[PDB]
Structures are given as C-alpha cells and as structure tokens.
Design a protein around this ligand. Structure first.
Ligand SMILES: Nc1nc2c(ncn2[C@@H]2O[C@H](COP(=O)(O)OP(=O)(O)CP(=O)(O)O)[C@@H](O)[C@H]2O)c(=O)[nH]1
Ligand SMILES: Nc1nc2c(ncn2[C@@H]2O[C@H](COP(=O)(O)OP(=O)(O)CP(=O)(O)O)[C@@H](O)[C@H]2O)c(=O)[nH]1
Ligand SMILES: [Mg+2]
Ligand SMILES: [Mg+2]
Lengths: 361, 358
C-alpha cells in the first residue's frame, strides 16, 4: 500500500483534502486546491529517478548506469476509493486497489510495478532506440490508489555536456529547453539533485533552478551519493547554509548503488541502510533526523500542507459573508415563504457545519 | 632528482634532445624540435592540479577541497647542466624562479607551493575570486626537457563567493587561450565517479580538437567509484573514443593531503590499487600515472623522430654545397681557405653520422 506516514501520501493529508472537498461541495465551489507538480532536475547520473521513486514509495522507474531516462515521465497520482488477476505478479506489494495506466496503452491496467518499469523501458526504445537518443515527447502514466493525492510528478533526462551515440551536437540545449518547459511553471516544486561526490558549484540542477526560481522559494537541494564521498569529506558546510544557500535548504540522501540494483535489494532495506549510514557517521550523527529520504518526504508534506491551508482564508470569508446573507434573508403564510424559510435554514446549518470543519484544521 | 625513466623527464629523451641541439648549432641548421605544451583541463575539483604534479614528479601545486587553482600556472621546465629546507629532495642543481620574484631561487618545492598560494591571494583574495593573469614559474634541472605545462582553474556552473554572474564564460575563455594552440596536448581530466557525458574537460577538448587527435582522457578518483562499477568500457574505446585513449589514475585523497603523505608512497598506493582490483589486475600496465607519463614520453619521441628525415636532407645538401666550394679550391689566403672549408666538410660529415645513429 502506497500509504506512507510523514510523506506525500500521509493518511492525514488525504483525510484533510477529503474533508475540504466535502466543505467545498456543501458551499458550492469547484475544489480550488491547486497542488504543485514535483519535478526532479540535475546532471545525468545524479540519481534523479531514484529520488523520485523514493517519494512515491514503490519501485517503478528505470535506474542504472549510462543514460537511462531519455523521455519525460509525467506521473499523475489519482485518488480512487475501492485474487486470480494477480497470478504471476512479481510485485509483493501488488493489490486490486492500486494500478498504473499509460495513455499510449488505453484500457491496460498494471498491478505489477515491475511491469510499469518494463513498459517505460520499452516505450523509451520504441521512440528513441537503444543508442542514447532523447525526445521531449512525455510518457504519460496515471497511478490509481485510495492512499494518494491528485498530484503530478515529473522525471526528466539529466543535463549532459558531451553528446553520445545518436545524440546531436546541440543535445545540451535540447535537454535544457525540455527541462525549462516543466520548471518555469510557478506551480512546480524543483528538486535540484546533485551528487555529493561532485563540487556543488558544478550542479546543473542548481544553475537551472536558480534561473527560474532565483529567490529559492520552490527549490529543495537534494545531495545524493553521500556514501561515495572521499573519506573525511562531508556536506555539513552545505547543510549549514555556507555554500549556495537555499531558503528551503538541502537534504542529503543515500539511495541504492548499482550493486543493490543488480541484487534487487528492496526499498525498505534501502531506507534502513540510509538511516544506519546517517546515525553511524561522525559528521551526520548530529540532528540525523534532518538526513535521508524520510526528511525530504516530510519537507514535501509540509509544503503541500501550506498549499492546502493557503486556501482557507478566502473560504472563511465566503462562508461568513454567505452565512450573514442567509441569516438576514431568514426574517399562516404562502407555499413560497414556508419553502424559502426551510431552504434558508438548511443552508444556515450547512454553513455553520462548514465553518466548524474549517476552524478544526 | 626530477629524473624519472619512462616519463617526460626520461634521461634518454634529455640526452637525445641535447645531442641534436648541439649538432644543429655546430652545423648552422634550424632546430625543428617544437615540443607541444601539456595543458590540464576539467571541471572544478576533477583532480587536475594532482595529475599535473604527478607528471613533474615532485610536489609543488596547491591541492585540496573547494576552489584551489584560481589563476593559470604556466610552468617552463628548463634544462640546465650544473657547475633550513623542509624538502628532502632539495639540491643545488634544481630550483624554481617566479617572474614576479626576479632572482629569488626556491630549492624547497614546499616554498614554491606556499608562494603560489600567496601570489594567488595577493591578486584574487580568499573568497573564490579568479583571474586570467598567469603565475609564471621556471624550474631549472639537468634532468628536464625545455617544456611548458599549464594548470588552470576548473570549469564551474554556479558563481560562489566574489565570483561574478558570468564566471563560467570567463573560465571557458581563459582555458581556450591555452588549448586552441594546435601544438597543445590536452589532458581532459574527469572524475571517474561521474558519467563521462558530464565531462567539461571532454566538452572543451572537443570544441578545439573535435577529431580527438591531441586529447588524452584522464579518469581520476577511480578509488571513489560505486562498488562493482569500473571504467573498463571507457578504456576499451566503447564510450567517446579518443585516438590517444584514456588513463585511469588514483591520486591522494583529502586525508592523505591532511596527513602530508609523500608522492612516492601515493604512486605505490596507486600501483597496489590497480594490481589488486578485480577489473584492472590483468590490465594494470595501462593504469596509473606511469602509463600517462609513458603516453606523453611516446608522443614527444614521435615529434622528435618525425623531424629527422627533413634534417638528414638539409645536412647532406649543406655538406654537398661545402664539398663543391672545396673542390673549387683544388696564396697564404688560398691555403687558409682550403683548411677552413675542409674543417667545415668534416663537421657536416660528423653531424650526418650522429643523426643517422638515432
Ligand atoms: N552509492 C550510491 N549510488 C547511487 C545513489 N543514487 C543513485 N546511485 C546510482 O547512480 C546510478 C544512477 O541512478 P539513477 O536513479 O538512475 O540516476 P539518474 O540521474 O536518474 C540517471 P539518468 O540521468 O540517465 O536518468 C545508478 O547506478 C544508481 O545505483 C546513492 O545515493 N548512492
Ligand atoms: N580519493 C581521491 N581523491 C582525489 C583524487 N584526486 C584528487 N582527489 C582529491 O580531490 C580534491 C581536489 O584535488 P586537486 O588536485 O586540487 O583538484 P583540482 O581539480 O585541481 C581543484 P581546482 O579545480 O579547485 O584547482 C582534493 O581533496 C584531493 O585530495 C583521487 O584520485 N582520489
Ligand atoms: Mg533517471
Ligand atoms: Mg587545481
């Protein structure tokens, strides 16, 4: 189950959105909650696909050596309330409440997230072959679950310097222009991913994020590969804010190495290895709870909570002003007058009830 | 001493060049030996300064964390036959002189290192500033060629400290100055712990050497790779191929630098790493500073030998001319003249002999 306390699929965050959708319906608004997209951006092989996969909480994105992500993967998470059909699933988490559908495969359902991964590899090769070609044409994936928000996440090819295989001379500009399409949207949280085993000032993720978000208002820095740093080096000076500071700060993570991927090590054991690495390192033992994938998921949870609560002032205003109106209108008699007193009274009670639910956030 | 068999300061290479230069000057023939400059280029913190240091064979370049090389270091190695130090290799035959300190001599290569740090701070301070103004260093030794080597600031993407918004273009323009020269070997330095497609060293090298004819890829930090990864596919030529190929190396890590580990122990650690690694054990002769040194030695040897046919031609045609003049003389003036022409013919014979041996 993709339910994960603390993260973007925190049960309380789902409960909050359902409660507000019930309020909006009774007060007569189409739900105005506009959740930002989450977009990962960095140099090629910074570990972007692994960071995005960890936020979703189940494996489905191709990860490996060489050039892997060669088309945008636009994932729509869609909230949907709810056996032989899982005969020869290889996915131990596979269940009838959660599946994927690809736009390019109408009516096919993937309960097995390994098959989602296989399909992303196949659809990539169908359009751009097996010699490093890249296309801006997105692969559109929807994932249905009772435990997710209505939210878009984007995985993107990494920025490169040197064309390989079938890539043209100007591949760097083409990947730069493809990425700007997704992060120029003011409603986009930019996860600027940089490998900790390169100097931060070489980060293409940070350079691009600073071009479109110079105030650093929707950019979180992610430092991958902290386990691969030269002995006695660390990212503490970056976390302490002394080097390219970001308003929203940086989170160091340790994802699976290529040996873990080849050994098919599961996400849960990878999360436990990451906790142990940070609790046992001299330099990260201090405030170790601010290290790792769970802290990045928490940062995102809080931003998403700020977006939902950002709507309440406007709503409190509309509730009280329509409450005042019906109370004034509410000052033997005709079929009209009796019916209208009843409708106005039913309305007053809903707006009281709505006002109560909004106060208790 | 800085003499190192197999590298750019191979004693046989020094002997050969001095012998030919003595011939050219004694017989009146233009010296065509034009040795390329050797220029290191890469991303900031790829390990460029350490690769250049290892080619010279004694420590003198600032290395460490953050932005370290912040001005060009143009080193002229100059061959010179001889007549309170903290440097155990210090000797009266080998010293450095900086243009900006005229007539000061540094026998202690630690002091050379200290002076590069001080002259860097004097012009661009201690908050990451960068200048294209070179620090000009000459190193005098009986054991070196007349050879120019250049260390350069790394290419960066994001300005830090005092750096201006357009620092990337300024560093790119400063580097192109040195590698646009067709007579430059480009050492494109890339950390092995990033995918080669991210190499700024290879991107810049490809702008001036698109055919990849004068570029050696150097892969540093092979000791820092993700467990079970290796650079074998790059060494096998299957990824951005270069005529002159790639050399993997392992330099001192920051802990080695903090512990002041000497160059000799670092070269022995590198040899053991490659002899003992699953992926490199059968190919260890193609690994390390010594293989990079050998590649450079061989290129230099090809340039010297490439000139000899043209030279043999000019020597014999000069010999033919003096022989014709001498046969013209066949009275105290006449006898002196016959002797001078005879002495001249013998020089060119002798010269022709010495060149044929090679
Ligand atoms: N040791 C270690 N290896 C990591 C880490 N994160 C990712 N890797 C390794 O880096 C490689 C790239 O992982 P990946 O998620 O595919 O990176 P990416 O940036 O998406 C690759 P592309 O840009 O081509 O899509 C894999 O070999 C993976 O195991 C990390 O935190 N630690
Ligand atoms: N483990 C390991 N660390 C390396 C390697 N080469 C260099 N380092 C480390 O990388 C850092 C940079 O080394 P340095 O030689 O100064 O690199 P650079 O590219 O010249 C730095 P700048 O671009 O700022 O001048 C130092 O901490 C050094 O010890 C290597 O092969 N292995
Ligand atoms: Mg990827
Ligand atoms: Mg340097």
């Amino acid at each position: 189950t993709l339910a994960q306390p603390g993260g973007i699929s925190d049960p309380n965050l789902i409960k909050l959105v359902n409660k507000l959708q019930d309020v909006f319906t009774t007060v007569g608004v189409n739900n105005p909650i506009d959740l930002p997209q989450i977009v990962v951006v960095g140099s090629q092989s910074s570990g972007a696909s692994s960071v995005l996969e960890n936020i979703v909480g189940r494996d489905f994105l191709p990860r490996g050596q060489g050039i892997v992500t060669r088309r945008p993967l636009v994932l729509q998470l869609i909230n949907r309330q709810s056996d032989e059909r899982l005969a020869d699933s290889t996915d131990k988490a596979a269940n009838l409440d959660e599946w994927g559908e690809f736009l390019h495969l109408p009516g096919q359902k993937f309960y097995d997230f390994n098959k989602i991964r296989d399909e992303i590899n196949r659809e990539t090769e169908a359009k751009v072959g097996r010699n490093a070609g890249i296309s801006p044409a997105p692969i559109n994936l929807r994932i249905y679950s009772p435990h997710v928000l209505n939210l878009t996440l984007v995985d993107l090819p990494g920025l490169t310097r040197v064309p390989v295989g079938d890539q043209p001379r100007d591949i760097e500009r083409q990947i730069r222009d493809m990425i700007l399409k997704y992060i120029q949207k003011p409603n986009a949280i930019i996860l600027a991913v940089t490998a900790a085993n390169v100097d931060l000032a070489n980060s293409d993720g940070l350079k691009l994020a600073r071009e479109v978000d110079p105030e650093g208002q929707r950019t979180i820095g992610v430092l991958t590969k902290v386990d691969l740093m030269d002995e006695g080096t660390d990212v503490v000076d970056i976390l302490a804010g002394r080097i390219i500071p970001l308003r929203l700060g940086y989170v160091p993570v340790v994802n699976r190495g290529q040996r873990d991927i080849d050994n098919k090590k599961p996400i849960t054991a990878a999360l436990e290895a990451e906790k142990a690495f940070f609790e046992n390192h001299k330099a990260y033992r201090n405030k170790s709870a601010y290290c790792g994938t769970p802290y990045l998921a928490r940062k995102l949870n809080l931003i998403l909570m700020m977006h939902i609560k950002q709507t309440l002032p406007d709503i409190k205003q509309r509730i009280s002003s329509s409450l005042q109106k019906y109370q004034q209108e509410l000052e033997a008699e005709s079929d009209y007058t009796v019916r209208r007193r009843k409708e106005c009274q039913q309305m007053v009670e809903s707006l009281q009830r709505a006002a109560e639910i909004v106060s208790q956030v």
